[PDB]
Design a protein around this nucleic acid. Sequence first.
RNA 1: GGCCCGGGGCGGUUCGAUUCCGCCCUGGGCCAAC
Length: 437
Amino acid sequence: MKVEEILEKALELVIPDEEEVRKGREAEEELRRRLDELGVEYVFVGSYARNTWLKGSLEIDVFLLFPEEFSKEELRERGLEIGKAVLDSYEIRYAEHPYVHGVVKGVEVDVVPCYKLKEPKNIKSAVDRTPFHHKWLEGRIKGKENEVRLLKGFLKANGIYGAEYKVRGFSGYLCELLIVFYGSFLETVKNARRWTRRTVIDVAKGEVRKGEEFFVVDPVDEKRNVAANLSLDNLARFVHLCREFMEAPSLGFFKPKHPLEIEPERLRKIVEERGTAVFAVKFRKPDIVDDNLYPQLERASRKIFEFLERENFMPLRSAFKASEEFCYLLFECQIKEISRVFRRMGPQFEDERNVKKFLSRNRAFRPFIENGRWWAFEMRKFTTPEEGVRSYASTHWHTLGKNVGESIREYFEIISGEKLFKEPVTAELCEMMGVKD
RNA sequence: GGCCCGGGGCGGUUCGAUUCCGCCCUGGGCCAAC
């Protein structure tokens, strides 16, 4: 029941079984013939090429090497022609530039056009850097592929594995550079417990130093940070997770946690006990990709959250959730209702000019002096958090992200009470309020 | 699309705004996309 014991059992959840490996070998085999029959210059990259793909995530990456001189237009057109001819079923995908996705003998395949270059300089898109990334990795990761899978499964089970915006976690590539550096999953974990928000891991120089931010320098390009999109809080959760695993190893660290759904009745009671204002802003999800949507959701929550704090509603935390249908921005505040009156600081008494202007304003209550300066009693246009956001969101829609903002400008409502407990947000709310059990 | 740094114009709020809330032009850096 010590680390060694647990990892043996974990490998079973991360390493693909013969029937999954075989399924892939057969797709690769068949895909190679289709490509060779056309005399196409390609290279298999990704975790499939390096047998480091996590169980249940089999997907073959085929990058087509195109002459340096070609125009981006050719790469896409000839690439679209090739993927079309070699796949059982195809579908155009769009990244920095479009490529093709499809299936071959039952397995997911990406046919990506890229430039064939020597020396990282002259990379025109991220996809061009990939070949170099693969080259640097194949000779060094060999032999440690299951250590990579253990790390992938760990991060996945704990909701931090992708590097895309919906996760802001540790990309696959980052995982492999980590194993090449520490040597194994256990060593990465042990040392990770010592990581700070200032850590810098330079793989090429086999060094660790103090920087201005968490920075894992790319072996193929010193100016690039592989963990660039690893959020500060996700970094923190990881570090904390390593301390815990080492303090009490468990196979649970590799098993996805159950949704743990709660009955809305119990949620209602908890919000009651808390005495806070819990509400959400609902609008229609713009028809855009997660990579453009989630950052907008993050911006939206933040701007409204900031409106809540300078307006004295004492917000505790915010959250958000997207469905096929709608989007929700969640909030919990300490103040359900504030007075209409509030004090406004005015000029110091010896300032005859401004004092005169400050008193020239007609107010309902008459200003006073306190500690050498004038203060005025003012009245608010709103006295509840919900009342405030309905105002803010109605006039500041344009600052809530291009798309999300435009969607809220055309429609939005603030839900609270029993009506909120009935939305597909009970999970986000429990995580927001720490609801344990 | 989001984040960072910088320019040129405005609106609102305020006794007082480069300084708070925002809107248009605009230069460069970076991130996700395998």
